[PDB]
Amino acid sequence: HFHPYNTLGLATQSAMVGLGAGVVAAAARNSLATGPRNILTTFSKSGGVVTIFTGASIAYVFTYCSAANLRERKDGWNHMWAGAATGAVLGARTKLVPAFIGWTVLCGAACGLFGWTGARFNADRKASLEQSPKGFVQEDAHQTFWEVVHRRPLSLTVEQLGEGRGINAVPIATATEAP
């Protein structure tokens, strides 16, 4: 089915990557600047970039792996919880409570909308319309995604929708027949 994650291993890999991105962005901030700057103002007038990269990396991957491990499935919700943790780390830099709540909620919603579309910038090859079976079914078969039919099985309607509202396993007519 699935495979659980190594939260400590993926977290320390991301911590090293965020440390590296912080050093690169601090050097790019020195060299693209004005005023008296030296070799030691890399981490002095840094603007706190290495804290941004480090905290965002560790929080997103730790909350993503922990939420994927306690739910025992991988879907778009884990990106929502991880993006909420990222928004918590980015929103604590502005030391205000309603700001913080806004950063958490909106960053979590944006990352959940990201992770629900596949969590990929690029395309998936087998899932797109162009590389998948489309059009009508040629004979009767299990109608896969992207396919059209004329008539659907009623057993599927009872299994997917329910046995309730106006919906029945037998139409209301021949359930009421004279013999």
Binding site: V170, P171, A173, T174, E177, A178
Partner: protein, 174 residues
Amino acid sequence: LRAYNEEKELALKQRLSQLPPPGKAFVTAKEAELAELAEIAALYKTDRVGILDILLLGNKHARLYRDNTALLKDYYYNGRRILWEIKREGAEKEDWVNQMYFLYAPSLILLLIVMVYKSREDITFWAKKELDQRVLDKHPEINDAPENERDALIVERIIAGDYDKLASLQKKAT
């Protein structure tokens, strides 16, 4: 239809050039200056041209016209607000009442009349007649009854049998 005169209309504009603006011509809170303007208000009220002239003639005449009617229009309504001017009667036709009482209102009454009589052809009248027809088709012997009995006899069959055929359309269920 009717016709206008060019020279009268040029003389109208020559009259209008020596006249004050509409924002001055009545703001004096009589008949030395206020008696030439009510003439001009009747000149607005009278209609200079019909349909045969507007199609066939050029645009210089039409521009001269439109300037004349705009100035006469201001001299009519400003004098009606401050103070033919010095009357007070009831009979009058606003510009819209020609084609709202005589075209909008009768077409709306025509929409009412066609909705009311088009409601005769409804599914419920037709379905009642059809169900009576099916009962008369299966059991024709109630034809032989007199007038008052037959309807009642039809009801005794409507209760005694469904007469739908809706289980026959759903032949894929059984």
